Design an enzyme around this catalytic site. Sequence first.
Site: not given
Length: 248
Positions: A37, A41, A162-163, A178-179, A181, A184, A186, A207
């Site tokens: 970020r 950003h 954002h993953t 967001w996920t 993980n 990680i 991916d 998003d």
Amino acid sequence: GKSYPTVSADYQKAVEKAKKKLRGFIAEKRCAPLMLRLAAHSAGTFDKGTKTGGPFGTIKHPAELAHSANNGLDIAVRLLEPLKAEFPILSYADFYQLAGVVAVEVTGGPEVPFHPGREDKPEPPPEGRLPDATKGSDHLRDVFGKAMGLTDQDIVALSGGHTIGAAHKERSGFEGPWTSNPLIFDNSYFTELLSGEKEGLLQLPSDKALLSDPVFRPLVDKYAADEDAFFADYAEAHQKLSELGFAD
Ligand code: HEM
Ligand code: NA
């Protein structure tokens, strides 16, 4: 369009040593998402028309940190100061972009090419150039396209940053990962976006805007289906973002 500056052998040596120290530090501190970020950003203040802002170390300045959009980035800057002091020859501008590249690598992402030579600029850009999480596809093109000079492909691939990580109610006001993980790197950001709003996971309006746009949606589908294709496009976009206004 890039013509990278020459830096001394000593500068190059410090880049290599700092890269390794950043891996260990970022992995240990669990701060890859915050560092990405910070790098990404902060790079996004570039305005191509005026050649102002961009990844030139101004985010170090209390005045830029104080922009409401940058809530929490003071933590990132503070975390990096002790390490940065071990590498006095490096610019802050290079150091922060290197941290972003390392953040992606240590979380399992692609290896984003890195070129040194950014100079630390004296004056922060004006507040208000950063992407607004509450807005949509038109706004995204205004900021990433009209200001930064990046492509529609770059927009969707970079949104995939954002993953890793999470929003915080005390920072932006949004809250959660967001996920499943968040440490990680991916293609799950895209998989989650497609599957709908699962409990405990976050989707910003920005998003969601990717799903309804005629150009963005095919890319979201591509990345959800093909992680290798995401990694390739991501590495390309991150490099471009980290180099806005630099070496042309
Ligand atoms: C597409 C336009 C973008 C918007 C609207 C946006 C907005 C946001 C917001 C609101 C947060 C939450 C901050 C918080 O409450 O802690 C956030 C976090 C984050 N952003 Fe973005 N961002 C964008 C682009 C990017 C890009 C291009 C990258 C890097 C490729 C990126 C990487 C991250 C990461 C890794 C986090 C998690 C930070 C953490 O875990 O502390 N974002 N973003
Ligand atoms: Na993930």
